[model samples]
Every structure is written in structure tokens, then in C-alpha cells.
Target: HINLKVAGQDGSVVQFKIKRHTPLSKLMKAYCERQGLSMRQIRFRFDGQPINETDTPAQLEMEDEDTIDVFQQ
Candidate 1:
């Protein structure tokens, strides 16, 4: 498992533990649900690249403690 941090537009941080093969969309959906927002209302990125819904941690080359920025779209 890997630990990742998602930084929200309002400066809030949400942390998740995910397997290398886990789809990033799982985390996004959980975050959206917790914040009462829809998946369409936000976007995610890492290293200046968009993070796709179908992308996994291993596919993105994400490491432990990696941070993904979340923004309103």
C-alpha cells in the first residue's frame, strides 16, 4: 500500500492509503462524497500532469507520501 495526500482548493488535506493497482478514481470519489461535491466539479493532477480516473498509483509512478493537487474545475 501507498500513502498519498490530496490537497484541496481550500487548503484542506485528505490522505488515503491505496494499493499500487488501485484506481485513482476511488480516492477521488471518496473525497467528493466527503466534501459533498461531485466528481465533475473537481480535477486532480500530479507533477503538472492530469491524473486520469483509470490510472493507478503504479501506473502514475507515485511514491509513498506523494501529494496530488485537487482543484475546482
Candidate 2:
């Protein structure tokens, strides 16, 4: 599990300790859908580095106690 800050465009923030097996893209998609957002609106960063289509789960590893940030913008 990893401690991640999931934020919305309207400034809502939710804390989640997600399973390491969870893909960052999947997590963001689910979170955004729950918040009435489009998956295209979400972006992620590990600590502070951005992860995008070019990055893989192997490259953006989420571990127990790791803190990643997800938000729109």
C-alpha cells in the first residue's frame, strides 16, 4: 500500500493507501470517475516527478508508504 494524495479540480483531496499492485493510471481513472471527472483530466507525480504515457508501472513504482500526488493541473 502507498499513501497518496488524490486531489480534484475543485480542490478536494482524498488520502488513499492503495495496493502496490494497483496501477497509477487505474487509480486515477477510478478516482476521477467517482468525482465526475474525465480520465484525460488527471495527471500524476511520484513525490514531485511527473509520470505520463511514456512511463510504465516498472518506472513509476508505487510502494508501501510511498507518497504520490494526483491532481488536475
lDDT of 1: 0.90
Best by TM-score: 1
TM-score of model 1 (CA atoms)? 0.92
Q: How does each model score on lDDT?
A: 0.90, 0.63
What are the per-residue Cα lDDT tens digits for candidate 2 across 1-73? 5576665446667766655555566666666677686767667777578866445444576555555566665
| True-structure Cα RMSD, model 1 | 1.0
Model 2 lDDT at residue 4:
66
lDDT of 1 by residue, 9-56 (tens): 688888998999999999888888887988888899988799988999
RMSD of each: 1.0, 3.4
Off-target runs (Cα >4 Å) in candidate 1 are none
